[PDB]
Amino acid sequence: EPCVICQTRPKNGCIVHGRTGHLMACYTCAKKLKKRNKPCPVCREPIQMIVLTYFS
Amino acid sequence: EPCVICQTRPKNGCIVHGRTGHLMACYTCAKKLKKRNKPCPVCREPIQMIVLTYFS
Ligand SMILES: [Zn+2]
Ligand SMILES: [Zn+2]
Ligand SMILES: [Zn+2]
Ligand SMILES: [Zn+2]
């Protein structure tokens, strides 16, 4: 299923905080949250980085 | 599908290199690769870090 935010792009934007990540959003939408200094939408941890994730 | 290495755990071990990640192994198997100084199994980039990834 697509990014829960835009419903258009795949869930390829891994929201990384320490050793864990929440993957529920696209890279574009996750980056927007990081750039706006917003926390992770599912766990409220501050975002360290967005990783463009490929499901090999 | 499960981790392509152990066939037991989920694909929750994101192999991070720069801004991208390859997600095909579990955290346990991916950590073994990083600890043994192995590159990413699909792209041969050095592994910067393993992120335990939850698919939401
Ligand atoms: Zn999106
Ligand atoms: Zn989170
Ligand atoms: Zn495994
Ligand atoms: Zn790779």
Residue numbers in the entry:
A (entry chain AAA), B (entry chain DDD): 427 to 482
How is this structure described in the published paper?
The importance of the ubiquitin ligase murine double mutant 2 (MDM2) as a key negative regulator of the tumour suppressor protein p53 has been studied extensively. Second, it promotes the proteasomal degradation of p53 by recruiting Ub conjugating enzyme (E2) thioesterified with ubiquitin (E2~Ub; ~ indicates thioester bond) via its RING domain and mediates ubiquitin (Ub) transfer from E2 to p53,8 where Ub is preferentially conjugated to lysine residues located in the C-terminal lysine rich region of p53.9 Although the relative importance of these mechanisms is context dependent, in vivo mouse studies with ligase defective MDM2 resulted in the same lethality as MDM2 knockout experiments. The RING domain of MDM2 has been discussed as an alternative target to stabilize p53.19 The rationale for this approach lies in MDM2′s ability to still bind and inhibit p53 when MDM2-mediated ubiquitination is abolished, thereby preventing uncontrolled activation of p53.8 The RING domain gains its E3 ligase activity through dimerization with either itself or the RING domain of its catalytic inactive homologue MDMX to form a homodimer or heterodimer, respectively. The dimeric RING domain arrangement is essential for E2~Ub binding and activation as demonstrated by co-crystal structures with UbcH5B–Ub (en dash indicates covalent complex).
To elucidate their E2~Ub binding mechanism, we assembled MDM2f in complex with UbcH5B–Ub for crystallization and obtained crystals that diffracted to 1.82 Å. All UbcH5B–Ub molecules bind MDM2f in a similar manner as observed in the MDM2h-UbcH5B–Ub structure, where key interactions are fully conserved. These structural data suggest that the N-terminal region preceding the RING domain of MDM2f is inherently flexible and the presence of E2~Ub does not restore the 310-helical conformation observed in MDM2h. The lack of 310-helices could explain the reduced UbcH5B–Ub binding affinity. Nonetheless, MDM2f binds UbcH5B–Ub in the closed conformation suggesting that it utilizes the same RING E3 mechanism to activate E2~Ub for catalysis. The 310-helices in MDM2h contribute to the stabilization of UbcH5B–Ub in the closed conformation and their absence in MDM2f and MDM2z might be responsible for the reduced binding affinity for UbcH5B–Ub.
